[PDB]
Every structure is written in structure tokens, then in C-alpha cells.
Design a protein around this ligand. Sequence first.
Ligand SMILES: [Cl-]
Ligand SMILES: [Cl-]
Lengths: 493, 501
Amino acid sequence: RSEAQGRLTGLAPVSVIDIGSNSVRLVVYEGLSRAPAVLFNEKVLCGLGKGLALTGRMHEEGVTRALMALRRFHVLSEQAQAQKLYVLATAAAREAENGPDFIREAEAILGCEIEVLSGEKEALYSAYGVISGFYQPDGIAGDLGGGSLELIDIKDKSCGEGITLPLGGLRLSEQSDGSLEKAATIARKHVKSFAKLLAAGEGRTFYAVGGTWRNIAKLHMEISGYPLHMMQGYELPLEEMLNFLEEVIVSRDNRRSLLPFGAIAMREVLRAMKPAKIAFSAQGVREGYLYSLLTEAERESDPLLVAADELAILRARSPEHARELADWSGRTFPVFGIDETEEESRYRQAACLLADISWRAHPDYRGLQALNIIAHSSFVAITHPGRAYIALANYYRFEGLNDNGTTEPLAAMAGERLQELGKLLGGLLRVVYLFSASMPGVVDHLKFRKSDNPDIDLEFVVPHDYCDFAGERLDGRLQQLAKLTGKRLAFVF
Amino acid sequence: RSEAQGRLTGLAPVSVIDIGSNSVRLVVYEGLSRAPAVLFNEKVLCGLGKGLALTGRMHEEGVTRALMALRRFHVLSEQAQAQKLYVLATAAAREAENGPDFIREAEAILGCEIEVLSGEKEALYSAYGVISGFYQPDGIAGDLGGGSLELIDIKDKSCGEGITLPLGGLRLSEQSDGSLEKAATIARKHVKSFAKLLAAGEGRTFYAVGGTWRNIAKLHMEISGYPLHMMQGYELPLEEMLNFLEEVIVSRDAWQAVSKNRRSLLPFGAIAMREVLRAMKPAKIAFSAQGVREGYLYSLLTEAERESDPLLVAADELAILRARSPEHARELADWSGRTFPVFGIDETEEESRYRQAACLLADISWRAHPDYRGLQALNIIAHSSFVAITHPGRAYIALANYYRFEGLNDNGTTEPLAAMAGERLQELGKLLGGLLRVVYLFSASMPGVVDHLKFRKSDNPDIDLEFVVPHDYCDFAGERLDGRLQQLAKLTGKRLAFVFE
Ligand SMILES: [Cl-]
Ligand SMILES: [Cl-]
């Protein structure tokens, strides 16, 4: 039914509809897997939660718009060829007198049962979304929605019991009657009740989830001119964050904005918690829900290495060679005395899996195209410095170990240690490509080792078979490596 | 076997080694097809023709280096899993005293015969290299090797008599004894005896092929600050080209790169080109990265493959490789052509080619983070090895697809490309981006919907065009579709409305 090679095989697309207190959203994924791409996305800001705190009903004008959006989401899901649909709804639908009627009507439109979450499940699925999107997280997640603020402790693949605070942006702005002062008093009082839970987050990371907070992050990126407009893993120290929140709070000198009330919610949490830093999550309840439906093996898999391998499958001349490299660089690094952290090893593996993705690009731009595709991919479980590292390693592999004006800013984001490790990988891959042509079967017969020679640090050993690959070019790229590493290299059969 | 979804299917890779006066090169292509990607690429400078003019023999040091290049290229062609090898050599390869032994050694190393091409076969294959890389070329093609110059008239897919002059850059530098005035005499004499063939090129295009002439183009781009460092389809008017060639000639007494390299062939290539251009007086010079070896493979294609449009073949291949639906990419190419006339656009055949390519390429960056989709589309299209497309046509495609993902506004990213493409192509790219933005909201980038959707005149005097939606698609109606159609209304200055039947 399709010529499409640009689509991962073995995956049937799946639609997830998320009915929230503010937005109603459709996303279609390639499949229910660890790292699928988004095949379609749509969001309508219905405001089902407007007035709910005051009236006990979802906003009727919002009910009308939400139902219209669902009719359209239904036909888009079909047109997008989704074979399964999951629908989630806000806990608000339970606290609304018109909730049951609304859900019934939504179910008739979508032909499908709707999972209406509890505050407990909202907190749980917020935590799963952080767990799924970060490598070894540690701190407290906060998901600010339209009506509620969920807080839950996180450590690696575990979470604590969630708490739910009535401090969502819609609720707080309505209850405060738009008074920033009153909004502060309400936030302060409710946060105060959980001083102990929060106090346990001091010096750890605050994981900030949800639309209003994501909007606070986007605005700070724009005003500070941050070069990578990438929510996932965007991180600020506590003091920079508290400082920017004060500015959001006092932005009188749309007056219908939730941003100040959201700013107050976060400030009151951060004052009770005192985390070292705030890390933003593009992933939330919806992604945490899907995480819970994966298999155990998929939950356990590394979403960065899964996405990097998928890109190799999709773009490399040889996916099999991409994996060879990852293992080979693994064995070689310790021979160059590099003692890498597990985070560093993860990133090197990713870099190797991504090393051949730009091969069809005009030769003058292969390095630059690699750098941009890598930097702009929707990876999770990678820090911004880690993105810089993987982009750099692959740029350096094409354009040499020299720094220039296009490497500078990535070098500044990576920091010195990751920049150096990147040069080393780029240097190592260049010597290897002269034997491999980016195809398998060759690289496992190449190796560095120690010398008995007092006047040689490492020896590069090639089979006598591969002597016709050898010459002036190898010796050039081998001398560049020796220069970089400060080690006397030697070639042998 | 392999998991590789990023290899075009049904293609055996093909290697071509070519042995020239100045270098030996290996290229591995994905396969023998109209627009295949380059799997592998390597060039070693050998200087085989150094001294050959005077001595009648190639240097031992050049022969030694070329043979080591070929031993390496042998194992690389196999490692790349190529299923066929072609080896082409210059006429001088055999005419050299020590050539027959070299050819024999090289054939042993490679396990394969070497086609030693006459100056006339090179002339013809250079023509086919130009024919294959340009849309309806019209002028004279010139290929400057180290030993000889070829000249051949090109008219669309047809071509004239191929001639050869002993005006290679290395040869001319040696026969002149390094004297630029003497070189001008040797070149004017040889070109003067083909004044009639060249006078026929007046007002047409000179297609410049070969290593040294390519380096003249790169230097001009480098010194001029030209933003798209893309050789194929790079084009200069006569008066600018002649000015630059004059600076190249007098370069010894900025610019410090070539002024210091006293062993450079560029001043002599600049002399040879000047004398051709004075005898010819073309409107413009267009450079070709394609030459003898591409024109040679082009001759082994089927007649259907040769007549197929390589820009469109490559755009479709990228849709096959990358798009959510290649079938839909093609629906878009069809649908938009039938919609333009409703908006009062009468497009030229070239403009239509490009629009089609833009549609086939619109979805190649769908996996990119949504903030970077437009920018990624723009960069992939700019950095891709398309042929039969001009630099303004490149800008069109990139802009069209940038607007599609990013909205119809201009910014510092679109200014350089808009400048290159010009106001007509820019506004056609905006129109296409605006139209693609609306239909996406019905299609979800998948097939079966868009052909049922049409624009037409409205009987309402307050609406100029209505977008007609069959009742089958009534539930696609929404808030998001309304905003996008109004962006198109503001763009086109026509009042638009949906009609959901
Ligand atoms: Cl879009
Ligand atoms: Cl939109």
C-alpha cells in the first residue's frame, strides 16, 4: 500500500486524544513504542476549566468547542491511518456536574471509551512522563495544569506518592479574583501544608511539567536569546529561575494571561523546595500514560539509543556498521585512557549510531547537515550539553579537528570535557572510515594497544590483508590523532 | 543482507575510476540510474602528465602514486560492495612511452579493462555530462584537462562535432615555459582555427567543465563571498567572468593564496578560457561538476531514463526515502498545478518544474522537532546534490518548503534565499506554502483527500474564491482551518471562504 521507506517498519500508528482543562489535543505516533515520531499534532484551547472552581461545571462554551474539536480529531485519526485510539480526560470532568454528560457525548463522537483520570493518576502519569524522558532523574516533578498542581518525588525509575494542590492557573486566577497578592497568599498557604515533602527536594532537580510552565520556559529562552529552542532538558539554576519569575509576576509595568499566576505557583514551590535547578519536560501525563502501556523491555530500553538506532536504520548506508562503531569506540576509549561516566558512554554510542545520517548531502555540507539534524532532533534523555557533544563529534568527523565559528557555540554549550571527548571520537572515526567506507566487516580488525617500545605510547594494528587501504592519508589522520591526544602513535601489521 | 531503509531499492552500486592528466579519482554511485546518490568519493593528485608534452613519457613518481591510488580504490570499491566497475583514462595514458606498461599494471591491480578515450570521445562524453546536468542546455561545452581542451556544441539533448585542442592547463604551462604572454599566443593560435564553431556560440551559454576551471569558479565564489558554495549550475555573465579571468592571470604581482603558489595551473586555465570566450562571446558561463564520467554513465542508461527529468527523479526519490506518504507528495504536485490557474497564475514550464519538485520535497523534514522543521527543510534542499536546477530555482524550493512549515512571514532566514530567487519565485513559493498549509489540515499528509477539494468563484460578491469541501469531509471543519485560509486570503489579496457541503 506504500513506497514509503521513511517510515519505521513493524509499527502501526496510534492516536492519543487528551481532553484537558485548557487544551484538547490530538497526537498520532508512528507506533506504541519507546521512541516513535509524531505523525500528526493538533491543539485547540477550549477552556473546559473556565469557571469550574466557582460554578461546579465545565464552561459550556468550552464544552461546545471541545466536542467540535473531537469530531475533527476523529476524522483526522482515520485519515492519518491510526489503528488504535487512546483517549484521556482531566480529573476536572469528575468534579463537574456536566462532566458525565460531556464524556458520554465525547465517547459517541470518538467511538471509544475515555479514561477519566483521578488526581492520583494525574500525579502518577506526570511522574512516568519525567521518568520516561530523563536519564536517572532525581528530585520532585511539578505538573501545573489549569485547575491543579501535581507534585511527586522522583528517583531513577521510581516515584513517591503524589499530592494535588488546587493551584492550577485558571483556578488560582479565578479564586484570587485576578489579585496577584491574593494568588500569592493562596499558593503560600497550600504549599505550606506540604513543607516536608518539598523540603526533601532541596539541592535536587525540580522537574517542571505543563503548558503554562513550558510557556514560562519559552519566554525566557526568547528574552535571553538562548540558542537552542528545545524544551526538553532546558535547565536553569534556582536563582536565575526565581529572578525571571519575579519579572513574569510583575508584567503589568493580554491582561487575561495565566503566566503570572503560574509564575506565583512555581515561586511558592521553589521557595519551599530550594532545588539546585529547574529542568523543563516536554513530556507530561499523556506521555506517562503511554509509557505505562509499553512492555517492560521497552520501558527499560534507553530512548536516546533507541531513537539514534532508528535514525541509522532510516538513513545510514549500513545500520549494522553504525552499531559496530558504537562497540568499537567503546573498546578503544579506555586504551586512550578515557575513563568515561555512563552518561558519556551513552552519548558516544549515540554519536556513533548517528555518524552516517547525512551521507547524501553534498560533500561540502555533510558535516554541517549532520550537526543540524542531530541538534534539531526530538531526542529525550539527553542534556543540552549532550546534544552539543553528539552534534560536535559528527561535525568534527567530517570537517576535521579544527574549531571554527559554527563549532564555537556548541563548544560553549558542551563544555571542555565533552568538546575534547568529541574531538577524540571525530578523530578516531576518521582513521576508521579509510578502511570501512562506512560498511561493516572491517572495523573489528582495527585496534589500538600499548607498546613495549619506550618511545611509543600506542600502536595502531591493522591486518596485513588491509595493507592496500594504507598510505599517506592514514598517516596524516593518525598524526592528527597523536597530536590531539598527545600520544606517540605507531602503525603496525 | 541489511536493515537499511535509507538505500534506494533495486540498485546495485556502480564504481567509476578515472585516470587523468592531474589526478586519479574513484566515485561509487548508488546505482546506474538517472539521479543516484554518491556512496563514496576519493581523489588523489598524481601529476601523470607532468613533463609528458616534452618527454613523451609520464613521471615515475606520478606513475607510482597513481598505482597506489588504484590499489586503494580497488579495495574501497569492494568494501562499498559495488557490482560493476568502469575505468576511464585520458588519451595520453597510452600515447606515453611508458603508458602501455602502466595500463597493464593498472588493469592487473583493478582486475578490469581501462577504456582509453580519444580526445573526440572525451568531447562527446563531456557533452553528455552537461546534457545530463542541465535542463535543456544551449551553447558550447568546454572541458579543460591537464593535456587537452575539448569544445562541443550543445542544443537541448542533441550535440555537435566534438573537437580537441592541445590546450590543457599543465601542457600549456610547460609549452609556454611558464610565460603568460607566450601561453596567450599558443592559446590564441589554436582557438583561432576554430573561430567558426565558436562564433556560433555567441549570445548563448558556455558550459565550463574540468578541474582547473572548477577551481577558478571556487576562487571566484570564495573571493566574491557568494553564499551558496554549490558548483553545479553556478553561472556568471561574460563581462564579470572576463574581469575575474584577468585578475587570475595577473595574480603574481587579498588574493594571497594563489599569488604565492608559483606551481599553480590557474593562470594558464584562465588564459585558455579567455581565448575561447573572446572567440565565442556567450551571454554567460555556467559551470558543471559533471563531466566525462557522468556523460559516460548517462550513455549506458536506457532512453527512458535519459529523457526522465533528473531534478524530479531525485525529488521523488527523496519523497520515497523520507516523506510520510510518497503517493501523497505526488498528489500535491498534481493538485497544486490545477489550483494555481484559479488564483490567476500562468506559470512557465520552468516554474512548473520547480513547483512540482517543491511538492515532492515538502514532507522530507517531518521528523524534525516542530520548531526546526522549516529551517531543516530549507537546509536539506539547499545542501542537496540536485542537477538540472539553477541557483534561483534552488532558492525557490527551499523558500516554498520553509513557508509551508513556518508560515508566510519573512525574516533574516528567508532574506538571503528571497534575494537569490527574486520577487517572482519568492511570491510563487509563498503561494505554494500557503496552499500546502491549508490542505495539510485535511490530508494529515496522507493520500485520498486533496483531489476532492477545489477552489472556485463565489456567487457571493463579498467572496472571490470559495474552498469547496464535499459532505464526506464535513467533520474536518474547525478553528485551525479558518485561520490558515485567512492567512492565504491576506497573502493573495482575495477574499476566501470554505463551503462545507
Ligand atoms: Cl503544519
Ligand atoms: Cl496552526
